[PDB]
């Protein structure tokens, strides 16, 4: 549950393993499920273990999902494994300006 009076930035992740074998080795057998809940957001995640194109040697992927939790609101992680949990939440400080370039700073 969010304490402060600014919105919260929550981020979690799912580990789509290289194969059902690795997924069983890590989180046990049986279908895996991660439901994420919130007053303004509700979704269900099921990992799809498969041998993706081998990026740098590892065929397994970890994807990240995010939500903004308004003040005095609760987020509920019900899960069964294959969950990359967060330790800290993020709170935006003020205002800023983002750019993209390769040129030197001055």
């Amino acid at each position, epitope marked *: 549950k969010n304490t402060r009076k600014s919105p919260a930035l929550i981020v979690w992740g799912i580990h789509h393993s290289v*194969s*059902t*074998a*690795e997924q*069983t*080795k*890590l989180y*046990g*057998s049986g279908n895996k499920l991660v439901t994420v809940g919130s007053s303004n957001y509700q979704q269900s995640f099921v990992p799809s273990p498969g041998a993706r194109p081998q990026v740098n040697g*590892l065929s397994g992927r970890i994807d990240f999902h995010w939500l903004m939790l308004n003040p005095n609101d609760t987020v509920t992680f019900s899960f069964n494994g294959a969950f990359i949990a967060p330790d800290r939440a993020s709170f935006l400080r003020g205002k800023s300006m983002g750019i993209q370039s390769g040129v030197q700073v001055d």
Partner: antibody
Amino acid sequence: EVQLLESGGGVVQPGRSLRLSCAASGFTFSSYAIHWVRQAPGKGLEWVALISYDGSNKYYADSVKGRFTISRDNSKNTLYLQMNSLRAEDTAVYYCNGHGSGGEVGSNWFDPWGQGTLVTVSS
Amino acid sequence: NFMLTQPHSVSESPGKTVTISCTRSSGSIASNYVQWYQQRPGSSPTTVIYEYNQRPSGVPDRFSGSIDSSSNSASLTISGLKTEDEADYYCQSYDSANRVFGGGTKLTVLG
């Protein structure tokens, strides 16, 4: 340099008890889970027991439940198998064998075995 | 829950290829990893294959692992047999946390 040292083997009678120990040296013992795997003479391998890296979980074979009790001392890097209420069939060579991911998922294959300690149970 | 059945014995001439099967009685062979162990007489077992096909550092290229989901089996195959290979071989898979060993397969190279 990595090695496992099984000790406590000998001849016993049925109905009695026994205790086995494994001395680990050469790796981070506190991180891997450890297994007891035996093999009767002329027979094949049989997984006996396992204990987790932090001793929270202990898993025993269905053919040995109730009698054997696994334990570990990480401060001493020692494994213990309590074989009370022995039977005639438990006669076998007893290997301690480390088998676990150890917190890493890349995890080059790490599965060390000892030399095995003979446990003869004749009448 | 399940048992791993492998043939009691097998033999083949040196230089020829040989394969050993490991059939799981209940449950998909792809559900849990399968390790292939080699045990020489008197010696402690040494892993030849892990995670169905992975060759640990030291094992020559002759050893290969395979999975046959159709017959729900796992096969360890050696090409170009050598008399050193004459040992017993055990396949091992996993029930939920417990390990399960095969019945053993005495591989003798023809002399």
